[PDB]
Ligand binder design. Structure first.
Ligand SMILES: COc1cc(N2CCC(N(C)C)CC2)ccc1Nc1ncc(Cl)c(Nc2ccccc2P(C)(C)=O)n1
Length: 265
């Protein structure tokens, strides 16, 4: 267990895009943290993606958002460390899974997600990678939105984007055009919340293919189909359908989601 300042690094708990995430025990505090360990050699070969994320994380203080506690950036060392509050239960689920959440467990987490995304949208942040593996379950049973590695900070009431980033299964149709286009960033987040809620209760994504262009094609043009098992309520089917509206103009928005009967019952 390598020691770095006050911390003692224990097992790897996962990997992000670059580097590793390790459980870390703090000797000053007598408590555990999650430490993202990044190699600057490896980031200098392929980030400025690291320092924007850090600038975003420093602005963010909400019980449904992961908390960045400190950055250890030595100019004359290779490693850059990023220390987060540990969210001790890990992700809300693995996808695909044969054991999806119940409708009631899904609602609980979905309410937390609304609260978190609403905060993020209020702070003028589009997450751009909302999915179950980025939603970490804490001590209290609540979720914290994690991984701001591709998020975008905007000026104005919405972000107006053209670049395609994120996880393909949760990308909205308006973002998958062959020609360059411009699309609302908030509506992207909402579509991803809908694919997320679909996963919560069915344990798989609504559109899936290993082939990227077959996936894009289904996202853009395949109608939403619900399986026979599980049998989910019609109020839930309506909310998912409204979030996975392929037209970003008519797609439901976060203020409307909050007032939806599946949410408020
Ligand atoms: C006991 O705590 C955790 C445990 C686990 N697992 C433990 C082994 C399981 N399997 C393989 C047996 C898989 C889940 C995952 C996360 C946390 N907690 C946690 N708290 C805070 C953070 Cl910032 C965090 N980051 C993290 C960890 C792994 C992967 C990716 C990120 P991000 C979303 C930042 O990119 N993780």
């Amino acid at each position: 267990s390598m020691q770095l300042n006050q911390y003692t690094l224990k097992d790897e708990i996962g990997k992000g895009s670059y580097g590793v995430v390790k459980l870390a025990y703090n000797e000053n505090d007598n408590t555990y943290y999650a430490m993202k360990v990044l190699s600057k050699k490896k980031l200098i070969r392929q980030i400025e993606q690291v320092y924007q994320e850090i600038a975003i994380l420093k602005k963010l203080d909400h019980p449904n958002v992961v908390k960045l506690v400190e950055v250890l950036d030595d100019p004359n060392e290779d490693h850059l460390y990023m220390v987060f509050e540990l969210v001790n239960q890990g992700p809300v689920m693995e996808v695909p899974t044969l054991k999806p959440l119940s409708e009631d467990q899904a609602r609980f987490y979905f309410q937390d997600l609304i609260k978190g995304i609403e905060y993020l949208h209020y702070q003028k942040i589009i997450h751009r990678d909302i999915k179950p593996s980025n939603l970490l379950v804490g001590e209290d049973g609540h979720i914290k939105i994690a991984d701001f590695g591709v998020s975008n900070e905007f000026k104005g009431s919405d972000a107006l984007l053209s670049n395609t980033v994120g996880t393909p299964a949760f990308m909205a149709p308006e973002s998958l055009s062959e020609t360059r286009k411009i699309f609302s960033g908030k509506a992207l987040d909402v579509w991803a919340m809908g694919v997320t809620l679909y996963c919560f209760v069915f344990g798989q994504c609504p559109f899936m293919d290993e082939r990227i262009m077959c996936l894009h094609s289904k996202i853009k043009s395949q109608a939403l189909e619900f399986p026979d098992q599980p049998d989910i309520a019609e109020d839930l089917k309506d909310l998912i359908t409204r979030m996975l509206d392929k037209n970003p103009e008519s797609r439901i928005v976060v203020p409307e989601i909050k007032l939806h009967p599946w949410v408020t019952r």
